[PDB]
Amino acid sequence: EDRPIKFSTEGATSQSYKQFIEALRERLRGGLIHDIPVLPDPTTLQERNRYITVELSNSDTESIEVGIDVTNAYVVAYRAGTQSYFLRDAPSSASDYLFTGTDQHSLPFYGTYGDLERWAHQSRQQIPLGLQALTHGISFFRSGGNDNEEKARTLIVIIQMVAEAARFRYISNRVRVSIQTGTAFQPDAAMISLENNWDNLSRGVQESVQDTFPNQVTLTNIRNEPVIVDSLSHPTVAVLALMLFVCNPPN
Amino acid sequence: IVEKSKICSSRYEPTVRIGGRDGMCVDVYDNGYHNGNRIIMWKCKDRLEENQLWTLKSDKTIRSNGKCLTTYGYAPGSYVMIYDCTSAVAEATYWEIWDNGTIINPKSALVLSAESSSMGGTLTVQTNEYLMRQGWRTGNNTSPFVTSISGYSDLCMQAQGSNVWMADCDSNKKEQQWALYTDGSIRSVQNTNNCLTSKDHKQGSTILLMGCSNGWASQRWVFKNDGSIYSLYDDMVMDVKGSDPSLKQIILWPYTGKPNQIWLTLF
């Protein structure tokens, strides 16, 4: 359908960022389940519709493109000029229709927090996010960023402000506020517990029996305290904007 | 779409507590599992015990210690009780827990309710009016979700006496913390005996704080994925009036999806 989903660090606003995430959400939804949007069933698509690109500009000249797998919203490759780099665990068909007229290269780690964090000797809680850290990522990568420590470090930023923002209304509100207040922020325990439990939340919702997840989801609030969820009527459930497809509930 | 795949398993049968009115649990009175014993609203005990644990079977029955949660009758007012599954009229043992927190006996179309504010009051089946006292939520942990709530122009809901309007989000303010209960109410952490309520059921109705004692429809709220705080009974949502925080008013209004109607729980 449409892949030139673009956001420009230039003269951005909370409103322009929200328009970015809205477009990005409209692209990846392939259904509703218990009224919440769910990404497409991976069996339903052909490799050619499996990837999209988000163009992140700092200027009409400097900017990068990120390859996203609509099947799970992950970042699998990034492109700068006629050079694309593919994460170590991007699917096999990646390079087939991602950054085709470019010298494609493989990176030696995947976009899994864990591997990215292993590389950037920092953790998500240490890496600040905001328009300033985004602008630097675009510049580092464009510039011919070659360092693995810092490539891994700027992917964390990119993944959270883009892929993690698309999935949860909470994370986009946060990203939107740091923009509106020109203030960088380090992800709190809620943000991280949300990022960590995406799959678990998605499953519980789709597998729920009588307004009930077969298995409880333990989140954490900002004060860093247990918020256990195990029902569709629990209000925390509403911060979910996009679920990972896991199974079609029997009718 | 094409050769579609996976279907979710129907073998799941969780046993969890069911919290409801004022945070109380569905309780088999005195672990009395004799046929006809009354089911009540009791305090959710500090430990997970059998008379407070219910298995959500795949045949639509709700069991505790094997016995089934069964109505007495199919008329508004008939009490619910514990009873051997195969001996009671099949249809009186079937229950449906909706996404909005309503437990309905399909056959009677009547709904589980905690008509009494008193801890220990018997549960009955009543006509469905989407009242706070007919709202439940499953899961062993029945603890409220204490959170702040921001909305229009990134302002947070603040309790100022018995009124409520948008103000600067301030982590320090205890008047901006709300306890989202199992029954679907939005209580002020300063006095959990108060619930966000709509004065009337008409569009324009101002919502404010009133006692949760009566458990009316205007005191039960549902947080939708679209961002609205929806009123199941009146088909309406919370509205920051005329997208103007300065009017210090949050009213009841139909969903148009405008920015003055979207809210977020900040944990």
From Swiss-Prot, chain B:
Q: Where are the 2-gamma repeats?
A: 234-267
Residue stretches of each 1-alpha repeat: 22-64
Which sections of the protein are 2-beta repeats? 192-231
- 2-alpha repeat positions: 153-188
The source's superkingdom equals: Eukaryota
List each copy of the Ricin B-type lectin domain by range. Answer: 12-139, 142-266
Q: Where are the 1-beta repeats?
A: 65-105
The entry annotates sugar attachment on: N100, N140
- Kindly list the cysteine pairs connected by disulfide bridges: C25-C44, C68-C85, C156-C169, C195-C212
Swiss-Prot/TrEMBL 1-gamma repeat ranges: 108-140
Q: What is this protein called?
A: Abrin-a B chain
Organism field: Abrus precatorius
